[PDB]
């Protein structure tokens, strides 16, 4: 009972799994800004650490990979998925990092990072533990899906 | 620790905590399908059960309860914020039940549901204490914030 698996299938049905039915079965019949595309992808991007504000690094990878707000509208919601984006070619590549992650990081800087500041050794091993394991759970549950199978895939780089 | 909590905290982090911030500094002086609320709530309704798919269960309440599709703007995200209202005099009620609960339930389908079909009373009592550790949590966070002890409930009925 680890809550990175949790949030991992949390993560994956609450978005993952929708944006690969949208890039399968949608994007190829919408216009995206005067585009329509035949190939996409989704790229799951990590927080090189789990630090305080994953939003912040979020923006900031957004903004570092040249990406534009767009949104894909599904019927598996009641609302569309926003997303960012980039063109390259004839493909529709988007990004997103995880922001569900949020919570790891507080429950492991509640258990932790006491009588001190900085991040022990310790922490960082139970935070990279996590890590892994959302990742390998997400990873799981992605090789189970034919869209996400498809279209989906985790990023290697730190 | 515990998955339920980490759940909470990210839910708290990803939604209850920018939604009190927009009912108290934003929606005064925004227009909601054309009219502008001077006082709001925000309710957290819970599944009666822990049952297969959240989003249906949300769907169906918010139609049992007559709201309509609107959406808050924030500054702390790169997208508005989608939700479910209603006017009650002059006040906003919004309503959310938490989709993020989906992988509570899976969890707990991997550990007790098996040699069965439905939810034998230990499977449902693991799963009462989860959402009641939920439940505990996102109070224990809306008390530390002023803006969601000011309008965020957690809903009373089952
Ligand atoms: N780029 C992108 N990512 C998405 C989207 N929808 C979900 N995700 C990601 O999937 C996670 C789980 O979504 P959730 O199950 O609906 O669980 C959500 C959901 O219950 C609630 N929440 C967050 N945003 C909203 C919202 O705009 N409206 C409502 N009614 N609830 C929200 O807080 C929980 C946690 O949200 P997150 O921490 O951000 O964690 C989210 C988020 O990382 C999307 O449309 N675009």
New interface residues.
């Given amino acids: 009972?680890?809550?990175s698996?949790?949030?991992?299938?949390?993560?994956?049905?609450?978005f993952v799994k929708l944006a690969a039915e949208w890039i399968v079965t949608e994007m190829p019949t919408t216009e995206i800004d005067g585009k329509t595309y035949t190939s996409g992808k989704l790229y799951i991007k990590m927080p090189e650490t789990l630090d305080t504000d994953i939003?912040k690094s979020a923006?900031l990878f957004?903004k570092k990979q040249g990406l534009n707000?767009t949104?894909m509208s599904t019927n598996?919601?009641?609302?569309p998925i926003?997303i960012?984006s980039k063109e390259e070619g004839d493909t529709l590549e988007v990004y997103d990092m995880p922001?569900?992650?949020?919570?790891?990081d507080?429950?492991i800087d509640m258990?932790f990072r006491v009588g001190h500041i900085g991040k022990t050794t310790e922490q960082q091993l139970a935070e990279d533990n996590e890590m892994n394991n959302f990742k390998r759970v997400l990873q799981l549950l992605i090789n189970e899906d034919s869209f996400c199978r498809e279209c989906v895939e985790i990023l290697r780089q730190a």
Wanted: proline letters at 3%; aromatic letters at 16%; glycine letters at 10%.
């Fill in positions: 009972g680890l809550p698996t949790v949030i991992a299938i949390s993560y994956f049905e609450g939003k923006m957004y707000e949104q598996h919601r009641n609302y926003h960012v922001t569900i992650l949020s919570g790891i507080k429950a258990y």
